[PDB]
Amino acid sequence: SNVSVLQQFASGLKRAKAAKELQHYVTMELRSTRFYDQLNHHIFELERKGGILAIASLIGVEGGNATRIGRFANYLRNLLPSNDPVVMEMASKAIGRLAMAGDTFTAEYVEFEVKRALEWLEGRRHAAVLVLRELAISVPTFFFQQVQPFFDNIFVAVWDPKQAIREGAVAALRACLILTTQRWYRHTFEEAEKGFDDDRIHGALLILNELVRISSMEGERLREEMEEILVESRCCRDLMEEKFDQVCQWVLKCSLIQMTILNLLPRLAAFRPTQYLQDTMNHVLSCVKKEKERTAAFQALGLLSVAVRSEFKVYLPRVLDIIRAALPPKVDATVFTCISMLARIQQDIKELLEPMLAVGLSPALTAVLYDLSRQIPQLKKDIQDGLLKMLSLVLMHDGSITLALRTLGSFEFELTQFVRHCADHFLNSEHKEIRMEAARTCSRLLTPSVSQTAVQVVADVL
């Protein structure tokens, strides 16, 4: 209990680390109290990721009410002020998980960490921004006690010459705006307008994207659905004009700016939908060919096609010629999601499905085909026949085939030879996941249970 748990904690620091932490949590849930604290101090003083996982895995499993929080507060505050790379985000997540217990000291431990978070507002500012984001995600009541000083500190802390600090500051401002709008916007719009008039480009774009997303959830719902597969309404013309001027001027001046422009163009097109839409379509058509910019450009084009349904229909032949030259060469994950979002224009996909079936078996393309067969049920048998032919060519003859079985049992098809070919798959394969998913899909495929020709194959597979 003392040597084996310490050996597992040392092996977690040196896939196996989270499994060892989960095994230690499952061993502590069944139950040596000082040996775990000594091992935690030895792993924290040395390394940091395994100790943070061992400190975070025991929270919510053992049941430490008051004695564990006073010991964990010093270990959470020691690494937060001077922080290393992304394991510091794991330390911030462990602090947010320790603050999410629901104890009496949580009103004292959070406000001591939030008021110090304004002391820093670059390894110190981004750690405070991540701590504020974790406190807003964990404790929304304790994070609303100091709202006047945080908006003044983040307006000056995000103006520093850094790239990684703005990605945390935008997330902290979005969590603060979500906590404000769930139960201020004019001062943030005034600060974002004063910051704009190449350092003050992408930060101002990310500051304006939060105000564009908080006022209108219609443009955000399409991006939230495609990812699985007053204040801003008044000053909307000048902000869109400044965004269009920044997109047209800074064309090839300064990667992050083009990505911020492609992210802000779809929300601005969905908020108010012909010259600005033509300039945004021209910018997306110019940025689709450039390197490291086509993944956001395809999603922005799909969002603008879902928003401007009547306006983008004249631009149907320009994009459809660009995708058909891309699939024929085989980064292919965003193209299927863009082709799925462009439909939500039905007869043009039947010539486009020939290359999409020829690209290969992937999860995003299968989800796009499922969403296209669910939303647009015009030609469902033509897609299902090609999917069945691709699955038969895959399973007739290397990793992806598990997902092929996952697509074989996902939705309905037009299947007695498949269950006779899959009833020998787990008898030959020595892999665990192949046998597991094969049994999982052929137990679902047997659901068409007074003719004695299906009874034979049902009895055979059973």
Short mmCIF file of C-alpha atoms in Angstrom, two decimals:
data_model
loop_
_atom_site.label_atom_id
_atom_site.label_comp_id
_atom_site.label_asym_id
_atom_site.label_seq_id
_atom_site.Cartn_x
_atom_site.Cartn_y
_atom_site.Cartn_z
CA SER A 1 0.00 0.00 0.00
CA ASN A 2 3.02 2.24 0.61
CA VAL A 3 5.64 0.92 -1.83
CA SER A 4 3.30 0.00 -4.69
CA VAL A 5 1.34 3.28 -4.68
CA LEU A 6 4.58 5.29 -4.55
CA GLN A 7 5.97 3.17 -7.40
CA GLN A 8 2.84 3.86 -9.47
CA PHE A 9 3.11 7.58 -8.67
CA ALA A 10 6.77 7.58 -9.73
CA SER A 11 5.91 5.67 -12.92
CA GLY A 12 3.21 8.23 -13.69
CA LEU A 13 5.74 11.06 -13.57
CA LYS A 14 8.37 9.26 -15.68
CA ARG A 15 -1.34 7.03 -21.82
CA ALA A 16 0.18 5.21 -18.85
CA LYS A 17 0.37 8.32 -16.63
CA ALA A 18 -3.37 9.04 -16.66
CA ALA A 19 -4.07 5.31 -16.34
CA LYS A 20 -1.82 5.15 -13.27
CA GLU A 21 -3.55 8.22 -11.82
CA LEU A 22 -6.97 6.67 -12.46
CA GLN A 23 -5.79 3.41 -10.87
CA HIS A 24 -4.57 5.33 -7.81
CA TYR A 25 -7.93 7.13 -7.61
CA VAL A 26 -9.81 3.82 -7.93
CA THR A 27 -7.61 2.36 -5.19
CA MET A 28 -8.19 5.39 -2.94
CA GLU A 29 -11.96 5.23 -3.53
CA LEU A 30 -12.08 1.74 -2.00
CA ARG A 31 -10.07 2.80 1.07
CA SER A 32 -1.54 5.35 4.23
CA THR A 33 -2.77 8.93 4.55
CA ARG A 34 0.67 10.44 5.23
CA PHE A 35 2.45 8.34 2.59
CA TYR A 36 0.30 9.87 -0.16
CA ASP A 37 1.11 13.37 1.13
CA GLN A 38 4.83 12.53 1.27
CA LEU A 39 4.71 11.14 -2.29
CA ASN A 40 2.82 14.24 -3.44
CA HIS A 41 5.42 16.53 -1.86
CA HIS A 42 8.25 14.47 -3.38
CA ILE A 43 6.64 14.59 -6.84
CA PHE A 44 5.84 18.32 -6.55
CA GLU A 45 9.33 19.31 -5.36
CA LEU A 46 10.96 17.43 -8.25
CA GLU A 47 7.81 15.47 -12.58
CA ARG A 48 5.34 18.34 -12.26
CA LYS A 49 2.75 16.81 -14.62
CA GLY A 50 2.58 13.48 -12.78
CA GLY A 51 2.38 15.24 -9.43
CA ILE A 52 -0.37 17.53 -10.72
CA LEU A 53 -2.28 14.50 -12.02
CA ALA A 54 -1.84 12.71 -8.68
CA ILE A 55 -3.07 15.80 -6.82
CA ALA A 56 -6.04 16.32 -9.17
CA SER A 57 -7.11 12.66 -9.39
CA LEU A 58 -7.62 12.33 -5.62
CA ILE A 59 -10.01 15.32 -5.57
CA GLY A 60 -13.66 14.26 -5.53
CA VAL A 61 -12.78 10.63 -4.73
CA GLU A 62 -11.35 10.57 -1.20
CA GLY A 63 -13.51 13.32 0.28
CA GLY A 64 -11.14 15.83 1.84
CA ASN A 65 -13.27 18.63 3.28
CA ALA A 66 -11.06 21.08 5.20
CA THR A 67 -7.65 19.50 5.89
CA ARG A 68 -6.82 18.72 2.26
CA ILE A 69 -7.69 22.17 0.89
CA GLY A 70 -5.29 24.01 3.20
CA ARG A 71 -2.50 21.66 2.13
CA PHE A 72 -3.35 21.87 -1.59
CA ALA A 73 -3.65 25.68 -1.61
CA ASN A 74 0.10 26.18 -1.11
CA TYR A 75 0.92 23.62 -3.82
CA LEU A 76 -1.52 25.36 -6.17
CA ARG A 77 -0.12 28.83 -5.40
CA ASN A 78 3.57 27.87 -5.60
CA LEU A 79 3.57 26.82 -9.27
CA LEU A 80 1.04 29.41 -10.50
CA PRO A 81 3.19 32.56 -10.08
CA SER A 82 6.23 31.40 -12.08
CA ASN A 83 4.93 28.88 -14.59
CA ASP A 84 6.34 26.41 -17.12
CA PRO A 85 4.60 25.16 -20.31
CA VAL A 86 1.22 23.40 -20.75
CA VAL A 87 1.49 21.37 -17.53
CA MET A 88 0.82 24.77 -15.91
CA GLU A 89 -2.62 24.57 -17.54
CA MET A 90 -2.99 21.20 -15.81
CA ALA A 91 -2.06 22.90 -12.52
CA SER A 92 -4.70 25.58 -13.20
CA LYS A 93 -7.23 22.83 -13.97
CA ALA A 94 -6.29 21.12 -10.70
CA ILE A 95 -6.82 24.41 -8.85
CA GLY A 96 -10.20 24.82 -10.54
CA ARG A 97 -11.12 21.25 -9.61
CA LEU A 98 -10.08 21.83 -5.99
CA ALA A 99 -12.16 25.02 -5.98
CA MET A 100 -15.17 23.08 -7.35
CA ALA A 101 -15.65 20.97 -4.20
CA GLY A 102 -18.28 23.17 -2.55
CA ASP A 103 -16.62 23.83 0.81
CA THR A 104 -16.74 26.76 3.21
CA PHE A 105 -13.19 27.87 2.35
CA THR A 106 -14.01 28.15 -1.38
CA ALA A 107 -15.22 31.72 -0.80
CA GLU A 108 -11.81 32.48 0.75
CA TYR A 109 -9.51 30.47 -1.54
CA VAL A 110 -10.96 31.85 -4.78
CA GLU A 111 -11.03 35.55 -3.82
CA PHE A 112 -7.45 35.29 -2.55
CA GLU A 113 -6.50 33.92 -5.98
CA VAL A 114 -8.59 36.38 -8.01
CA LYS A 115 -7.35 39.52 -6.24
CA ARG A 116 -3.78 38.31 -6.71
CA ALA A 117 -4.63 37.69 -10.39
CA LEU A 118 -5.00 41.45 -10.83
CA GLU A 119 -1.47 41.85 -9.42
CA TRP A 120 0.08 40.31 -12.55
CA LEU A 121 -2.35 41.99 -14.96
CA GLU A 122 5.44 36.10 -20.53
CA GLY A 123 4.87 33.28 -18.06
CA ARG A 124 3.10 35.30 -15.35
CA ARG A 125 0.24 37.13 -17.09
CA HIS A 126 -1.00 34.12 -19.06
CA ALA A 127 -0.99 32.01 -15.88
CA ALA A 128 -3.20 34.60 -14.16
CA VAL A 129 -5.48 34.71 -17.22
CA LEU A 130 -5.75 30.91 -17.19
CA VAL A 131 -6.44 30.98 -13.44
CA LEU A 132 -9.20 33.56 -13.99
CA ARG A 133 -10.66 31.44 -16.81
CA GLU A 134 -10.59 28.32 -14.63
CA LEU A 135 -12.20 30.25 -11.75
CA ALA A 136 -14.92 31.53 -14.09
CA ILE A 137 -15.48 28.01 -15.41
CA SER A 138 -15.55 26.46 -11.92
CA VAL A 139 -17.01 29.08 -9.55
CA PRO A 140 -19.23 31.64 -11.34
CA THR A 141 -20.49 33.13 -8.06
CA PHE A 142 -17.03 33.75 -6.57
CA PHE A 143 -15.71 35.18 -9.85
CA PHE A 144 -18.46 37.84 -10.02
CA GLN A 145 -17.30 39.54 -6.79
CA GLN A 146 -14.56 41.52 -8.61
CA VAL A 147 -15.78 42.64 -12.04
CA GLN A 148 -14.78 46.34 -12.09
CA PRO A 149 -11.03 45.82 -11.59
CA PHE A 150 -10.69 42.83 -13.93
CA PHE A 151 -11.99 44.73 -16.98
CA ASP A 152 -9.52 47.55 -16.26
CA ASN A 153 -6.61 45.14 -15.74
CA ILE A 154 -7.28 43.02 -18.84
CA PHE A 155 -7.49 46.11 -21.07
CA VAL A 156 -3.86 46.97 -20.25
CA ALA A 157 -2.48 43.44 -19.77
CA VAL A 158 -3.52 42.24 -23.25
CA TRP A 159 -1.85 45.21 -24.99
CA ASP A 160 1.64 43.80 -24.35
CA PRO A 161 3.75 42.47 -27.26
CA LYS A 162 2.88 38.79 -26.94
CA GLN A 163 0.93 36.20 -28.93
CA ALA A 164 0.15 33.53 -26.32
CA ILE A 165 -1.26 36.03 -23.81
CA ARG A 166 -4.03 37.25 -26.14
CA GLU A 167 -5.39 33.72 -26.66
CA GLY A 168 -5.94 33.44 -22.92
CA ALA A 169 -7.15 37.02 -22.53
CA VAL A 170 -9.81 36.54 -25.23
CA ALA A 171 -11.04 33.36 -23.50
CA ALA A 172 -11.11 35.13 -20.13
CA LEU A 173 -13.02 38.07 -21.64
CA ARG A 174 -15.45 35.64 -23.31
CA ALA A 175 -16.06 33.84 -20.00
CA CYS A 176 -16.55 37.20 -18.26
CA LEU A 177 -18.98 38.35 -20.96
CA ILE A 178 -20.85 35.03 -20.68
CA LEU A 179 -21.10 35.44 -16.90
CA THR A 180 -22.29 39.03 -17.39
CA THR A 181 -24.87 38.21 -20.08
CA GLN A 182 -26.17 35.11 -18.28
CA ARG A 183 -27.40 37.25 -15.37
CA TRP A 184 -20.07 46.76 -19.27
CA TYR A 185 -20.30 46.08 -23.00
CA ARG A 186 -20.05 49.77 -23.93
CA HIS A 187 -16.76 50.28 -22.07
CA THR A 188 -15.31 47.17 -23.75
CA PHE A 189 -16.48 48.41 -27.17
CA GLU A 190 -14.94 51.82 -26.44
CA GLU A 191 -11.64 50.20 -25.42
CA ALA A 192 -11.67 48.01 -28.55
CA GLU A 193 -12.35 51.07 -30.72
CA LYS A 194 -9.59 53.06 -28.99
CA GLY A 195 -7.10 50.22 -29.41
CA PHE A 196 -7.60 50.06 -33.18
CA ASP A 197 -6.99 53.76 -33.87
CA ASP A 198 0.90 45.39 -36.60
CA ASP A 199 0.47 44.70 -32.89
CA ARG A 200 -3.06 46.16 -32.55
CA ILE A 201 -4.70 44.09 -35.30
CA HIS A 202 -5.31 40.50 -34.18
CA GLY A 203 -5.97 41.52 -30.57
CA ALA A 204 -8.59 44.04 -31.67
CA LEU A 205 -10.10 41.40 -33.97
CA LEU A 206 -10.28 38.85 -31.13
CA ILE A 207 -11.76 41.53 -28.86
CA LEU A 208 -14.41 42.38 -31.45
CA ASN A 209 -15.21 38.70 -32.12
CA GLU A 210 -16.35 38.23 -28.51
CA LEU A 211 -18.70 41.22 -28.79
CA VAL A 212 -19.95 39.90 -32.14
CA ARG A 213 -20.57 36.43 -30.65
CA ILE A 214 -22.20 37.54 -27.39
CA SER A 215 -24.87 39.71 -29.06
CA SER A 216 -25.76 37.18 -31.79
CA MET A 217 -25.87 33.45 -31.02
CA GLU A 218 -27.14 32.56 -34.51
CA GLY A 219 -23.67 32.73 -36.04
CA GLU A 220 -22.19 30.83 -33.10
CA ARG A 221 -24.71 27.97 -33.25
CA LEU A 222 -23.64 26.98 -36.77
CA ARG A 223 -19.99 26.85 -35.69
CA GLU A 224 -20.96 24.88 -32.57
CA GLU A 225 -22.94 22.40 -34.70
CA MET A 226 -20.31 22.05 -37.44
CA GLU A 227 -17.55 21.41 -34.88
CA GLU A 228 -19.22 18.20 -33.65
CA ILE A 229 -19.48 16.68 -37.14
CA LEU A 230 -28.41 46.77 -27.85
CA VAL A 231 -24.69 47.53 -27.58
CA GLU A 232 -23.28 45.70 -30.61
CA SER A 233 -26.44 46.26 -32.69
CA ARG A 234 -26.07 50.06 -32.53
CA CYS A 235 -22.35 50.42 -33.35
CA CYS A 236 -22.40 47.71 -36.02
CA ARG A 237 -21.83 49.75 -39.20
CA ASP A 238 -18.59 51.44 -38.12
CA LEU A 239 -17.18 48.23 -36.63
CA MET A 240 -17.95 46.28 -39.81
CA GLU A 241 -16.43 49.08 -41.90
CA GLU A 242 -13.25 49.06 -39.80
CA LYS A 243 -13.09 45.25 -40.03
CA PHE A 244 -13.52 45.38 -43.82
CA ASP A 245 -10.83 48.07 -44.07
CA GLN A 246 -8.46 45.98 -41.94
CA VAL A 247 -9.21 42.89 -44.04
CA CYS A 248 -8.68 44.73 -47.34
CA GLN A 249 -5.57 46.64 -46.23
CA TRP A 250 -3.71 43.91 -44.29
CA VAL A 251 -3.86 41.26 -47.01
CA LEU A 252 -0.29 39.90 -46.79
CA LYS A 253 1.20 42.18 -44.12
CA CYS A 254 1.09 40.09 -40.94
CA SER A 255 -1.06 34.30 -40.57
CA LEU A 256 -2.73 35.19 -37.28
CA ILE A 257 -4.29 38.35 -38.73
CA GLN A 258 -5.68 36.46 -41.73
CA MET A 259 -7.08 33.75 -39.43
CA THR A 260 -8.67 36.41 -37.21
CA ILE A 261 -10.17 38.09 -40.29
CA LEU A 262 -11.53 34.77 -41.57
CA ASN A 263 -12.99 34.08 -38.12
CA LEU A 264 -14.56 37.55 -37.80
CA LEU A 265 -15.94 37.68 -41.37
CA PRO A 266 -18.46 34.85 -40.83
CA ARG A 267 -19.98 36.33 -37.66
CA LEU A 268 -20.16 39.76 -39.30
CA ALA A 269 -21.85 38.21 -42.34
CA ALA A 270 -24.32 36.27 -40.17
CA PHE A 271 -25.12 39.31 -38.00
CA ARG A 272 -26.14 41.51 -40.95
CA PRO A 273 -26.40 40.11 -44.52
CA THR A 274 -23.72 43.34 -51.26
CA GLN A 275 -20.28 44.93 -51.61
CA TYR A 276 -19.01 43.81 -48.19
CA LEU A 277 -20.17 40.23 -48.80
CA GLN A 278 -18.46 40.31 -52.21
CA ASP A 279 -15.23 41.57 -50.63
CA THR A 280 -15.43 38.86 -47.95
CA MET A 281 -16.04 36.19 -50.61
CA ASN A 282 -13.10 37.53 -52.63
CA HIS A 283 -10.89 37.47 -49.52
CA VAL A 284 -11.97 33.89 -48.75
CA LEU A 285 -11.35 32.87 -52.38
CA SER A 286 -7.88 34.43 -52.22
CA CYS A 287 -7.07 32.85 -48.83
CA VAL A 288 -8.33 29.38 -49.81
CA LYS A 289 -5.32 28.83 -52.10
CA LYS A 290 -2.70 30.13 -49.65
CA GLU A 291 -0.90 27.76 -47.28
CA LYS A 292 -1.93 27.40 -43.61
CA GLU A 293 -5.15 29.36 -44.22
CA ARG A 294 -7.56 27.05 -46.09
CA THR A 295 -8.95 25.25 -43.02
CA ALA A 296 -10.44 28.41 -41.53
CA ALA A 297 -11.37 29.69 -45.01
CA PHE A 298 -13.47 26.61 -45.82
CA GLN A 299 -15.31 26.90 -42.49
CA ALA A 300 -15.85 30.63 -43.07
CA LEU A 301 -17.18 29.93 -46.58
CA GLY A 302 -19.55 27.30 -45.20
CA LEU A 303 -20.71 29.68 -42.47
CA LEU A 304 -21.29 32.45 -45.03
CA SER A 305 -23.17 30.01 -47.27
CA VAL A 306 -25.36 28.98 -44.33
CA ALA A 307 -25.89 32.64 -43.39
CA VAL A 308 -26.21 34.25 -46.84
CA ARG A 309 -28.24 31.55 -48.58
CA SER A 310 -29.53 33.64 -51.50
CA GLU A 311 -26.36 35.71 -51.93
CA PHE A 312 -23.84 32.85 -52.11
CA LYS A 313 -25.84 30.92 -54.74
CA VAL A 314 -24.18 32.96 -57.50
CA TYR A 315 -20.77 31.92 -56.09
CA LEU A 316 -21.58 28.19 -56.26
CA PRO A 317 -19.46 27.38 -59.34
CA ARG A 318 -16.33 29.13 -58.03
CA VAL A 319 -15.97 27.04 -54.87
CA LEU A 320 -17.20 23.73 -56.33
CA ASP A 321 -14.38 23.79 -58.88
CA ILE A 322 -11.87 24.33 -56.06
CA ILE A 323 -12.93 21.31 -53.97
CA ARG A 324 -13.03 18.83 -56.87
CA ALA A 325 -9.34 19.50 -57.60
CA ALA A 326 -8.49 18.96 -53.91
CA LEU A 327 -10.14 15.56 -53.29
CA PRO A 328 -8.63 14.14 -56.51
CA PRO A 329 -5.09 14.53 -55.15
CA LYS A 330 -5.80 12.35 -52.11
CA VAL A 331 -6.13 18.51 -44.16
CA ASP A 332 -9.14 16.69 -45.62
CA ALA A 333 -11.15 16.96 -42.38
CA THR A 334 -12.36 20.56 -42.83
CA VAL A 335 -13.31 20.14 -46.51
CA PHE A 336 -15.99 17.54 -45.71
CA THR A 337 -17.41 19.75 -42.94
CA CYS A 338 -17.45 22.72 -45.33
CA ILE A 339 -19.22 20.65 -48.00
CA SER A 340 -21.74 19.53 -45.37
CA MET A 341 -22.32 23.10 -44.16
CA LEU A 342 -22.64 24.52 -47.69
CA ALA A 343 -25.74 22.41 -48.37
CA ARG A 344 -27.65 23.64 -45.31
CA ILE A 345 -27.64 23.06 -54.12
CA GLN A 346 -28.58 19.38 -54.09
CA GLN A 347 -27.93 18.03 -57.60
CA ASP A 348 -24.35 19.38 -57.58
CA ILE A 349 -23.31 17.06 -54.73
CA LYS A 350 -23.93 13.89 -56.78
CA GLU A 351 -20.91 14.74 -58.93
CA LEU A 352 -19.01 15.73 -55.77
CA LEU A 353 -19.73 12.50 -53.87
CA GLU A 354 -17.64 10.47 -56.35
CA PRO A 355 -14.39 12.03 -55.09
CA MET A 356 -15.52 12.17 -51.45
CA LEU A 357 -16.01 8.41 -51.55
CA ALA A 358 -12.63 8.14 -53.29
CA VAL A 359 -10.82 10.22 -50.64
CA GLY A 360 -11.01 7.46 -48.03
CA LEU A 361 -12.78 6.28 -44.88
CA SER A 362 -12.59 8.98 -42.20
CA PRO A 363 -14.77 9.99 -39.25
CA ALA A 364 -15.38 13.59 -40.33
CA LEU A 365 -16.35 12.58 -43.88
CA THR A 366 -18.68 9.90 -42.48
CA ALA A 367 -20.29 12.45 -40.16
CA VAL A 368 -20.64 14.87 -43.09
CA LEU A 369 -22.28 12.15 -45.20
CA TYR A 370 -24.61 11.27 -42.31
CA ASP A 371 -25.59 14.93 -41.84
CA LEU A 372 -26.14 15.29 -45.60
CA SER A 373 -28.33 12.18 -45.73
CA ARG A 374 -30.25 13.38 -42.67
CA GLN A 375 -30.79 17.00 -43.74
CA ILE A 376 -31.05 16.61 -47.53
CA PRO A 377 -32.82 13.26 -48.19
CA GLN A 378 -32.98 13.75 -51.97
CA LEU A 379 -30.46 11.09 -53.06
CA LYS A 380 -30.01 8.80 -50.06
CA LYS A 381 -29.74 5.46 -51.87
CA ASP A 382 -27.00 6.79 -54.18
CA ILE A 383 -24.86 7.76 -51.18
CA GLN A 384 -25.68 4.56 -49.28
CA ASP A 385 -24.72 2.35 -52.24
CA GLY A 386 -21.34 4.08 -52.53
CA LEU A 387 -20.81 3.84 -48.77
CA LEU A 388 -21.66 0.12 -48.84
CA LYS A 389 -19.32 -0.40 -51.80
CA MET A 390 -16.50 1.41 -49.97
CA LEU A 391 -17.15 -0.61 -46.81
CA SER A 392 -17.18 -3.86 -48.81
CA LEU A 393 -13.91 -2.91 -50.51
CA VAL A 394 -12.43 -2.07 -47.10
CA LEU A 395 -13.58 -5.24 -45.32
CA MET A 396 -13.00 -7.58 -48.28
CA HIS A 397 -9.20 -7.42 -47.96
CA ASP A 398 -4.99 -1.47 -42.30
CA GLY A 399 -6.48 0.75 -37.81
CA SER A 400 -9.22 2.53 -39.72
CA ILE A 401 -11.26 -0.66 -40.22
CA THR A 402 -12.54 -0.43 -36.63
CA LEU A 403 -14.14 2.89 -37.57
CA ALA A 404 -15.40 1.13 -40.71
CA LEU A 405 -17.24 -1.28 -38.41
CA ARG A 406 -18.32 1.79 -36.44
CA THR A 407 -19.75 3.18 -39.66
CA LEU A 408 -21.26 -0.21 -40.53
CA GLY A 409 -23.47 -0.16 -37.43
CA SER A 410 -23.99 3.61 -37.28
CA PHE A 411 -27.08 4.14 -39.46
CA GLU A 412 -29.33 1.96 -41.60
CA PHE A 413 -28.36 0.30 -44.89
CA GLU A 414 -29.96 -1.90 -47.53
CA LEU A 415 -27.23 -7.20 -44.84
CA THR A 416 -26.94 -10.98 -44.52
CA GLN A 417 -23.58 -11.41 -46.26
CA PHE A 418 -22.06 -8.68 -44.08
CA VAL A 419 -22.98 -10.50 -40.86
CA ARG A 420 -21.61 -13.72 -42.36
CA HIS A 421 -18.34 -11.96 -43.20
CA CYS A 422 -18.20 -10.25 -39.78
CA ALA A 423 -18.93 -13.43 -37.79
CA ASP A 424 -15.44 -14.67 -38.72
CA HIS A 425 -13.69 -11.35 -38.05
CA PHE A 426 -13.31 -11.80 -34.29
CA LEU A 427 -12.25 -15.45 -34.69
CA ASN A 428 -9.22 -14.54 -36.83
CA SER A 429 -8.14 -11.18 -35.40
CA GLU A 430 -5.98 -11.21 -32.26
CA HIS A 431 -6.59 -7.50 -31.63
CA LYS A 432 -8.82 -6.49 -28.73
CA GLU A 433 -10.57 -3.48 -30.27
CA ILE A 434 -11.24 -5.28 -33.57
CA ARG A 435 -13.04 -8.14 -31.80
CA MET A 436 -14.84 -5.71 -29.47
CA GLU A 437 -16.17 -3.42 -32.21
CA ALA A 438 -16.93 -6.39 -34.48
CA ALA A 439 -19.12 -7.97 -31.79
CA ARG A 440 -20.63 -4.55 -31.04
CA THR A 441 -21.66 -4.02 -34.67
CA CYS A 442 -22.88 -7.54 -35.47
CA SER A 443 -24.97 -7.60 -32.31
CA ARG A 444 -26.70 -4.48 -33.65
CA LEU A 445 -26.96 -5.84 -37.21
CA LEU A 446 -29.07 -8.84 -36.08
CA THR A 447 -32.17 -6.77 -35.28
CA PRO A 448 -34.19 -7.92 -38.39
CA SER A 449 -35.24 -11.12 -36.62
CA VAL A 450 -41.74 -16.87 -40.67
CA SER A 451 -39.16 -17.84 -43.29
CA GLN A 452 -36.29 -20.21 -42.49
CA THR A 453 -33.51 -18.45 -44.40
CA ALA A 454 -32.85 -15.61 -41.95
CA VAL A 455 -33.36 -17.88 -38.93
CA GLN A 456 -30.30 -19.89 -40.02
CA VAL A 457 -27.98 -16.88 -40.18
CA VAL A 458 -29.45 -15.44 -36.95
CA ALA A 459 -28.76 -18.74 -35.16
CA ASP A 460 -25.26 -18.93 -36.70
CA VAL A 461 -24.22 -15.42 -35.62
CA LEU A 462 -25.89 -15.84 -32.20
#
